Design a protein around this ligand. Structure first.
Ligand SMILES: *[C@@H]1O[C@H](CO)[C@@H](O)[C@H](O)[C@H]1NC(C)=O
Ligand SMILES: *[C@@H]1O[C@H](CO)[C@@H](O)[C@H](O)[C@H]1NC(C)=O
Ligand SMILES: *[C@@H]1O[C@H](CO)[C@@H](O)[C@H](O)[C@H]1NC(C)=O
Ligand SMILES: *[C@@H]1O[C@H](CO)[C@@H](O)[C@H](O)[C@H]1NC(C)=O
Ligand SMILES: *[C@@H]1O[C@H](CO)[C@@H](O)[C@H](O)[C@H]1NC(C)=O
Ligand SMILES: *[C@@H]1O[C@H](CO)[C@@H](O)[C@H](O)[C@H]1NC(C)=O
Lengths: 118, 223, 183, 83
């Protein structure tokens, strides 16, 4: 339930509203189904549904000195896919047929509206 | 022919929006709020309500998608060393301040300060301001401690003066210029950063490119 | 759009022939006017939606054309424009209503750390690497590339002299021999 | 965004020449401009004035001394001769 507390309506209170049917978890993982305000849910085991705070990833610090460097010694060539739509399906209509299919009086009435069709 | 004999280093600003405020509208409530007769009459118009709701939901999900696209480009979170020693450079204006309840830089704080039920609601963004600030701080730490390598593979550490020397070499200027004008260049860089900090405020025509977004959203809802 | 033809829009029926086969023209015209208003509005909104979608499709097509021109016909230096890493080359493939690019990149794998020095003082004059960076394993000093470790012996063609040893911060003493001296 | 850029500050006028003829052979700079202060000829980079003596290592020979237009005559130092 969106933007309401668990009073008007297991049962958990979130920043977005009242959540019913999930168990809150102290741990943090990667988002699977977004919920709102940093909360996400996923189906993980006893299989159930858990709500947890989004995590940005693994923390990683680099040993920064003022006279030290790091240099690679071995490489790797990889391949990645990129996908891009180019064209849509082209169509066309006959306005007068679609509006007044086979009706002379209906077409005559339609004639009193101008160049909408064109 | 003319050849320069001295140089300057300067800093500028660039402002540009990423997302607007998502929203939604309940068609039946807005049009015929709590009226069975009016709902029955509206039933004779087809699927206009469903079309409008679908369009609005698409807009909202697109807003979340583009915010994520702009910010979440790196996954690993980096942190700056506790000892600030970069050969004279001073990043205190841009690095986050731990003492503040929100771990954000003074410049970010100034920027945050400077910008100000008939079926319609406002939904919250999926990604929060603290998370966005954490992304920004991670990017800043990565670029100050590694260079460009953390965006092309495993982050490798290099001294900051050496990174600066490489970047001088990237515009056709040899590295000895940096190596023998380090102190002057650092002083000029720090002074320029301070000038930007001062000049960001004291002008009510800088954050217009965001104020207009806010005003347009408010005006559309109001009308 | 097709299904929108089954709504009466407030009239007594939603089928034109039945509407006109039961009533006189003076009232059949009112009913027909109601239907034509509704159907014209539906067609209008369909066309507007199609225009707005066509704009986005055209933007995507322009991006695809730029990517094809700049990464299939040549090698690009715009980072993360044609795949993550140092771009090498790419291949196009067809698809229904689109394309697919197979970007080929280059990613360093295994890193080891050393100690560096911005300059090397030999005889009161500084030395800087022509290309690469000075590295040392703790007992000897080499010069190497910046993306693939490959040490080389320091000499007078890998370095150029500039200034003295009293201006650079972090300079380190080391020998730099002349190749023509042993001969 | 806070972009950081580099801008030249103070200029001076110099006299240049596309090539230098030494011994019937033309000389062109590998990277830089042939500049003169009115007395001597030097070679320097383009975005920061830093002269240095014209040697055989910072230039390359290509062609004869009667094709290029504007070529001038000067002395090209040789580094290994004193050694
Ligand atoms: C909803 O309940 C929460 C606590 O359960 C309370 O803080 C909040 O003020 C309530 N809001 C309304 C509108 O009742
Ligand atoms: C930085 O480099 C200098 C160079 O000699 C060294 O003395 C110093 O210990 C290094 N670290 C710090 C924190 O100054
Ligand atoms: C580099 O990695 C490949 C496999 O990834 C391995 O076969 C090769 O031995 C490695 N190179 C070195 C020098 O270890
Ligand atoms: C060159 O100009 C810069 C820009 O202000 C300045 O920092 C530096 O002192 C100048 N160099 C001089 C005066 O030798
Ligand atoms: C850096 O700047 C801050 C504020 O601009 C100042 O307090 C500090 O003394 C400067 N130097 C260092 C080393 O932090
Ligand atoms: C490098 O050698 C010179 C001459 O022998 C000496 O004056 C200087 O102190 C040496 N450098 C260091 C760091 O000891």
């Amino acid at each position: 339930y969106q933007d309401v507390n668990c009073t008007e309506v297991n049962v958990f209170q979130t920043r977005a509203g009242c959540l019913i049917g999930a168990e809150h978890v102290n741990n943090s993982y990667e988002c699977d189904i977004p919920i709102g305000a940093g909360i996400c849910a996923s189906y993980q085991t006893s299989q159930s549904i858990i709500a947890y705070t989004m995590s940005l990833g693994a923390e990683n610090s680099v040993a920064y000195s003022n006279n030290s460097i790091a240099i690679p010694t071995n490489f790797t060539i990889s391949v990645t896919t990129e996908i891009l739509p180019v064209s849509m399906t082209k169509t066309s209509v006959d306005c007068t047929m679609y509006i007044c299919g086979d009706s002379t009086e209906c077409s005559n009435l339609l004639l009193q509206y101008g160049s909408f069709c064109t | 022919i003319a050849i320069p004999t001295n140089f300057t280093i300067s800093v500028t600003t660039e402002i540009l929006p990423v997302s607007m405020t998502k929203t939604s509208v309940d068609c039946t409530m807005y049009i015929c709020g709590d009226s069975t007769e009016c709902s029955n009459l509206l039933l004779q118009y087809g699927s206009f309500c469903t079309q409008l709701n679908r369009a609005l939901t698409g807009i909202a999900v697109e807003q979340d998608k583009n915010t994520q696209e702009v910010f979440a480009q790196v996954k690993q979170i980096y942190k700056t060393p506790p000892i600030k020693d970069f050969g004279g450079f001073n990043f205190s204006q841009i690095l986050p301040d731990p003492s503040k309840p929100s771990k954000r830089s003074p410049i970010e704080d100034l920027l945050f300060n400077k910008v100000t039920f008939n079926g319609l609601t406002v939904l919250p963004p999926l990604l929060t301001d603290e998370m966005i600030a954490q992304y920004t701080s991670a990017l800043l730490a990565g670029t100050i401690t590694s260079g460009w390598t953390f965006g092309a593979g495993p982050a490798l550490q290099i001294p900051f003066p050496m990174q600066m020397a490489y970047r001088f070499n990237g515009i056709g200027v040899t590295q000895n210029v940096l190596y023998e004008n380090q102190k002057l260049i650092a002083n000029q860089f720090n002074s320029a950063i301070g000038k930007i900090q001062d000049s960001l405020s004291s002008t009510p025509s800088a954050l217009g490119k965001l104020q207009d977004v806010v005003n347009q959203n408010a005006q559309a809802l109001n009308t | 759009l097709v299904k929108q033809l089954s709504s009466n829009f407030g009239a007594i029926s939603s089928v034109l022939n039945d509407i006109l086969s039961r009533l006189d023209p003076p009232e059949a015209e009112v009913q027909i006017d109601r239907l034509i208003t509704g159907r014209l509005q539906s067609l209008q909104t369909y066309v507007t939606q199609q225009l707005i979608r066509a704009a986005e499709i055209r933007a995507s097509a322009n991006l695809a054309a730029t990517k094809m021109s700049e990464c299939v016909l040549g090698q690009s230096k715009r980072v993360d424009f044609c795949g993550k890493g140092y771009h090498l080359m790419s291949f196009p493939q067809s698809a229904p209503h689109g394309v697919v690019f197979l970007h080929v990149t280059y990613v360093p794998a295994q890193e080891k750390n050393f100690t560096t020095a911005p300059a090397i003082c030999h005889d009161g004059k500084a030395h800087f690497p022509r290309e690469g960076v000075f590295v040392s394993n703790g007992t000897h000093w080499f010069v190497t590339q910046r993306n693939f470790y490959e040490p080389q012996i320091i000499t007078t063609d890998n370095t150029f002299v500039s200034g003295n040893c009293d201006v650079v911060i972090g300079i380190v003493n080391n020998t730099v021999y002349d190749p023509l001296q042993p001969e």
